[PDB]
Ligand binder design. Structure first.
Ligand SMILES: Nc1nc2c(ncn2[C@H]2CN(C(=O)CP(=O)(O)O)C[C@H]2O)c(=O)[nH]1
Ligand SMILES: Nc1nc2c(ncn2[C@H]2CN(C(=O)CP(=O)(O)O)C[C@H]2O)c(=O)[nH]1
Ligand SMILES: Nc1nc2c(ncn2[C@H]2CN(C(=O)CP(=O)(O)O)C[C@H]2O)c(=O)[nH]1
Ligand SMILES: Nc1nc2c(ncn2[C@H]2CN(C(=O)CP(=O)(O)O)C[C@H]2O)c(=O)[nH]1
Lengths: 133, 133, 135, 133
């Protein structure tokens, strides 16, 4: 019940999201939710050729701005974004069921009780064999 | 649709398969189908603590042997394996729907029409941004 | 030839940079230079437990005191000098450095020879590569 | 002396080794030393276009063949191999100082007091952040 997101896979998902976001010229900018959306944001910015990357922290119109986070679950962040950026295009990479109807787009379905680990919280490390033989 | 198998992901599936082949001592060795089964074979051998790794090329009876290939589709390979090693336990990492019942064990379901690419056939290389913006 | 930086390696270098910047609490925040500094910035923020990540874009207040400013690579020092003018008191770091730019950064991790071309993992992907022999 | 070798990096080395074993048709087969040489051997097989991959196990004439292991250190393994296959071309990916001239080819020089960790003994796992802040 643990979902491992490797860097390569994250990048594959982000490129899929970026192609759906084409043409790039419809967008003025990218706003990354600190800090889960920072990496997915950098990835969109690279693929869409958008240099205007901003961050917003959560403890303005927004039309033509992509607002990105890594995951939607409850949708609390999605709600909070709408306060200052009600016309923004809110997207995430991953979505759990309750958050699915609260985003403008997402790439991968994740079940509610699955724990997803993001690659910035992981590393390549020695792992003992499954069998002591 | 193009399915990309990264090394990290391949290894994750191999470990999932290995814990299903637990306990290890029930096995005497492993036979890898050249060349698709070579790497998954190596990984199984590591995770099970088995040094006896053999190979077979497809143009002894197999008792207590694991026979591994990367992907089952038609089951042509499975047939030959069953003829050479009727007493052997045949597994793959990936299975397309036709092959699904022709293996004793597998890990990942692949659609019939999806093209899967294995990491030994790929490499990390510059890829032009999706947008020229 | 080309120096390939994979995601795994970049992260190893960022963690090394993070350990040197310890203890975290001596820092108010992180300013990532868009776009090269964004991922290295995000990695630093995770490792130092800093939630306050800003960005700066250079084209073509504060003095930055207590802030880390991060970019991917220093070479000429064009970005560096703009960063000095804009943030005279920030600690300016990169992951990679070519010899021309070394004296202009407060800290970096990997020395890259001047004429080496380095490819960052956000510009790369896992793709089919034809075998070396046709046989 | 904490040297992490990832899958991508291993594959880069194996491709470099394959290139210097060119032209391919001068070889008739590859013999992988189990278990260290299996993945490298599999990679050589793909790159040189050799379907004929065998294995050999050593515990405690080979003409026109490549025998491959992951690393030479003492050369003890090389000795057994020269005895078994006096005309084989013996190659490794990595070589520590005592072993370097004891193989016909290698790619990476490794210091004696460096411990390298191969990617089949590792995995992507959660790593606590450097600061608890
Ligand atoms: N790494 C990881 N994080 C998770 C997981 N599930 C929930 N989250 C996060 C969701 N979250 C948010 O602020 C987003 P939202 O709930 O839509 O406002 C805080 C975290 O709990 C999970 O399986 N793995
Ligand atoms: N790389 C890759 N290979 C594939 C794919 N689908 C089928 N194969 C192979 C399956 N195969 C076999 O000999 C095994 P079997 O069909 O069970 O006897 C030959 C190939 O066509 C695919 O999506 N990608
Ligand atoms: N990916 C990669 N980028 C490079 C390389 N060498 C130079 N750069 C960049 C450095 N750069 C900057 O604005 C930073 P600075 O030169 O200190 O002002 C522009 C690019 O030319 C290289 O080998 N690889
Ligand atoms: N993964 C890894 N393995 C190592 C290392 N150094 C030595 N080895 C192995 C080399 N070895 C051999 O039998 C080869 P040889 O000594 O030439 O006959 C057994 C292990 O000690 C190391 O840094 N990393």
């Amino acid at each position: 019940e643990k979902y491992i997101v490797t860097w390569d896979m994250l990048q594959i998902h982000a490129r899929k999201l970026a192609s759906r976001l084409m043409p790039s010229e419809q967008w003025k900018g990218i706003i990354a939710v600190s800090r889960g959306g920072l990496v997915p944001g950098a990835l969109l910015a690279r693929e869409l050729g958008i240099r205007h990357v901003d961050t917003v922290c959560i403890s303005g119109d927004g039309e033509g701005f992509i607002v990105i986070d890594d995951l939607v679950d409850t949708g609390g962040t999605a709600v909070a974004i709408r306060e200052m950026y009600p016309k923004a295009h809110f997207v995430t990479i991953f979505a759990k069921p309750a958050g699915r109807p609260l985003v403008d787009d997402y790439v991968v379905d994740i079940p509610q009780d699955t724990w997803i680990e993001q690659p910035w919280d992981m590393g390549v490390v020695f792992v003992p064999p499954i069998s002591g033989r």
